[model samples]
Target: NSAYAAGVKIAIVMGSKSDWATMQFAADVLTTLNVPFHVEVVSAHRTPDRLFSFAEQAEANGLHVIIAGNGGAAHLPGMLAAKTLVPVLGVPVQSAALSGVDSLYSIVQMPRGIPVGTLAIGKAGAANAALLAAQILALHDTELAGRLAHWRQSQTDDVLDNPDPREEA
Candidate 1:
């Protein structure tokens, strides 16, 4: 079943299929949280037209937030922000050459007008983006807010559940 057809509210857009390795972190969180979401590859350079179309139609397509991940000359998130009013969360995939510093700079250094809420590099960032998206969407959805709160609490519990760093041998 299409997550979009099921009334998805989150959109995970990556610059390339390869980025899925990192972007899946975000998807996994959304799935665990039971937040409907759709994923796609919309490169800023390779498929500018599709990027524009996806950004332009995001709201009409029933999406509230967009998580965009790219490595190197990362512009997908910033470009999406330029094209749409939907909240864009930028995830910088760790580059093999630069370890994602380049992607981080490219995504974080946006012009004054456009804004893309940048996240950490790689998997951590992707997962946080999903959490942030859930938080944003939860503002208008009480049920979702409750679910998010529980999710957060469970995380806290997991940490508490593992109080000792090393077990007695």
Candidate 2:
């Protein structure tokens, strides 16, 4: 069955297939939260047409949030936000040169009319993007709300239960 038909509400798009290394954190969180999603590679530089088309079709396809990751001249998330009303969560992939400072600036410094909710410079950012989406979803989805509550408590318990930095031999 199609993701839409199955009640999928999130879409994760990366600028390059190589970006999957970083972007998968977002997918992993969604998977744990029982949130179905769609993932794809839509290059703003290499495949402009497809990027535009994807943005155009996002809402009709029942996408409530878009998680976009890009590096170097990162423009995918901002451009996608320009075209679609779906809230765009931008993850900055670390670049070879400046280590994603360029990416962070590009996504974070958007024109006044358009905004991309720019995130941290890698995996944690991508993971939080998914969590944020789940939070949005959970505002109306009880199942997800329950899962998030447990997930948050579990992490807290892990920290509380293990206060020592020294590892066991």
Candidate 3:
């Protein structure tokens, strides 16, 4: 059974199937931390009705966080934020033309009222979005907090395990 099978605390949305390649970094982290999440393609442009419905019912559906990925105009995340109170974490997927600068700008430049916690770009952004979501969830989940702490410690241990770059001979 996948995360979706168990019901989800996090909802990961993307503009298209194309966004999955980068958005999967977010899914990977959530899966690693055993955080149940649902993934879907809900384009702000093409599927506005679906986006609206998803956002409107998110909290009632038991979702704590929403991670939205989009390239080019990158309007998906912002639209989600606008529609719901659920925390929206935006990952700017890289585009062939601008390498995601367009996405970063579009997402980060939202008006003062609506807030979207925008991440870096591509995989790093997606990974951080998951971590951020986990941290938010860990506020009430002791078991999840322990797992997140261990994950952080493992990252540090990995860096310390390879202290210097001179060994790459």
Candidate 4:
């Protein structure tokens, strides 16, 4: 279903098909949390026009967060920031040569004014994007935020404190 019709709160945009594997982390997290997201592939190099239109209408279309994943010369997120006032999250998919250094550089090297809450490369970034979106959404939801807090505490409790000596050492 279209975000416009179904009331999607998050938009997942990638610069290339290759970034799907990385973007899936964000999608999975959003899914697990029962958050709705619409994924799109709008390349700055391949489809600048579509990118512009998508960014321009994102807020009007009921999108709150835009999680953008791009590898190599990642420019999709930054370009998106320029067009809209909505919060943007940048995920740098690991590339062949630099292992996403180039992608990270392109995404993180945004100008002073615009801000994109960039996350760690690959899956962590994708997962964190969902958490960030949750935090933003939590502003109007005390119950949801409490749920998230419990989840975070559970994760903390799951920590082994150190490597399992019997399993690895």
**Per-residue alpha-carbon lDDT of candidate 4 for residues 1-169, written as tens digits (9 for 90 to 100):** 3434774889988998888888888998778777778999999999999999999998888888899999888889999999999899999989999998998898998989988889888899989988998899889868768878887887876665535656742
Q: Which structure among the candidates has the greatest TM-score?
A: 2
Off by over 4 Å in 4: 1-5, 160-169
Give the Å shift of residue 36 in candidate 2: 0.2
**Model 3 poorest 10 in a row by lDDT:** 1-10
TM-score-better candidate, 2 vs 4: 2
Query: Which scores greater on lDDT, model 2 or model 4?
Result: 2
In candidate 1, stretches whose alpha carbon ends up further than 4 angstroms from where it belongs are 1-5
What are the lDDT figures for the candidates, one per model? Answer: 0.91, 0.93, 0.92, 0.86
Q: After superposition, how far is residue 101 of candidate 1 from its true place, in Å?
A: 0.5
| Residue 27 C-alpha lDDT in model 1 | 95
> For candidate 3, lDDT tens digit of each residue in 1-169?
1324455789888999999999999999998999988899999999999989999998888888999999999899999999999999999999998999999999999999999999999999999999999999999999999999999999999888888888652
Residue-wise C-alpha lDDT for candidate 1, range 1-169, written one tens digit per residue: 2343676888898999999999999999999988988889999999999889898888888878999999999989999999989899999999989999999999999989999999999999999999999999888999989999899899899888888979531
**Residue 53 deviation, candidate 1, in Å?**
1.2
Which is the leading candidate under lDDT?
2
Off by over 4 Å in 2: 1-4, 167-169
lDDT against true structure, model 3:
0.92
How high is the lDDT of residue 15 in model 3? 99
